[PDB]
């Protein structure tokens, strides 16, 4: 019958106000859901190349890599070193088969860059915040449910807002701007101009989003086989993509 | 040589 497998990566970043990356963290998991007959054995093939850790001898370079990996106690690793194959007899229902972590660069560019322009009349109290968001995914690929959260100085009110496209929404709530951008593709540049009154702590911006058909680490499941219909997904998500302004 | 978890 049916087997579902997902590679799911949670991304966290801290980006400095000048655009330079300070921190990157990916926590990845491979999750399996299946309902197979008695004694059924499954093999999972990963990206052929990929290395684990930081070899003192060989160093570490571009290539697909993770800083550490761990495996469910039922997984047999006899073919992992030579072929990156995992083997196991799954239970009925859900299992996490593998976890991994990456803290060093990504093999691909970060999905979002923000270009803020802030002018603050100290003044009439007028605060103008211009935000341009650039998606640096490929033009084919999509970011879903993108929301930007931006803390604002105490007691700020919205005077006006102009968004670069009709499908965006934005509101002040809970002392912060919430900007929703439900249409975002690689290469998109979306922007918002916000006029507020302040009667610093502006920022940092925190983005949240899902990236379907994507892994931040570059890791992929190459095959899934019995020794049934198959659904294989690769997803990255973030609720902690922090950009100082 | 490898780390394992139970869940």
Author numbering:
A (entry chain A): 185 to 383, 400 to 427, 436 to 453
B (entry chain B): 686 to 692
Paper's wording?
Adaptor protein complex 4 (AP-4) is part of a five-member family of heterotetrameric adaptor protein (AP) complexes, AP-1 to AP-5, known for their ability to recognize sorting signals in the cytosolic domain of transmembrane proteins destined to post-Golgi compartments. In the case of AP-4 it localizes to the trans-Golgi network (TGN;), from where it seems to participate in several sorting events, such as to the basolateral membrane in polarized epithelial cells, to the somatodendritic domain in neurons, and to early endosomes. A stronger and more functional interaction is one recently found between μ4 and a YXXØ-type, YX[FYL][FL]E motif contained in the cytosolic tail of the Alzheimer's disease amyloid precursor protein (APP). Unexpectedly, the binding site for the YX[FYL][FL]E signal of APP is located on subdomain A of the C-terminal domain of μ4, but at the opposite face of the predicted YXXØ binding site.
Surprisingly, the single mutation D190A abrogated the interaction of μ4 with the YKFFE signal. In contrast to what we expected, the single mutation D190A did not preclude the interaction of the μ4 C-terminal domain with the ENPTYKFFEQ peptide, instead the ITC analysis showed a single site on μ4-D190A with Kd = 40.6±2.6 µM. To determine whether the single D190A mutation changed the conformation of μ4, we solved the crystal structure of the C-terminal domain of μ4-D190A (residues 185–453 of the human protein) in complex with the ENPTYKFFEQ peptide from APP at 1.84 Å resolution. Similar to wild type μ4, the μ4-D190A C-terminal domain is organized into two subdomains, A and B, and has an immunoglobulin-like β-sandwich fold comprising 16 strands. The overall crystal structure is virtually identical to that of wild-type μ4, as demonstrated by a root mean square deviation of 0.190 Å for superimposable Cα coordinates. As was seen with wild type μ4, of the ENPTYKFFEQ peptide, only the TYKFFEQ portion was visible in the density map and, as expected, bound to the μ4-binding site. The area of the interface between the YKFFE signal and μ4-D190A is 431.1 Å2, analogous to that on wild type μ4 that is 430.5 Å2, as calculated by the PISA server. The μ4-D190A - YKFFE interface maintained considerable polarity, and all eight direct hydrogen bonds between μ4 and the peptide are preserved. Of all the stabilizing interactions, Y687 forms with its phenolic hydroxyl one of the shortest hydrogen bonds with the carboxylate of E265 on μ4-D190A. Additionally, Q692, the last residue in the peptide, forms a bidentate salt bridge with its free carboxylate and the guanidinium group of R283. Together, this crystallographic analysis demonstrated that μ4-D190A binds the YKFFE signal, and provided evidence against the possibility that even a minor change in conformation was the cause of the weaker interaction.
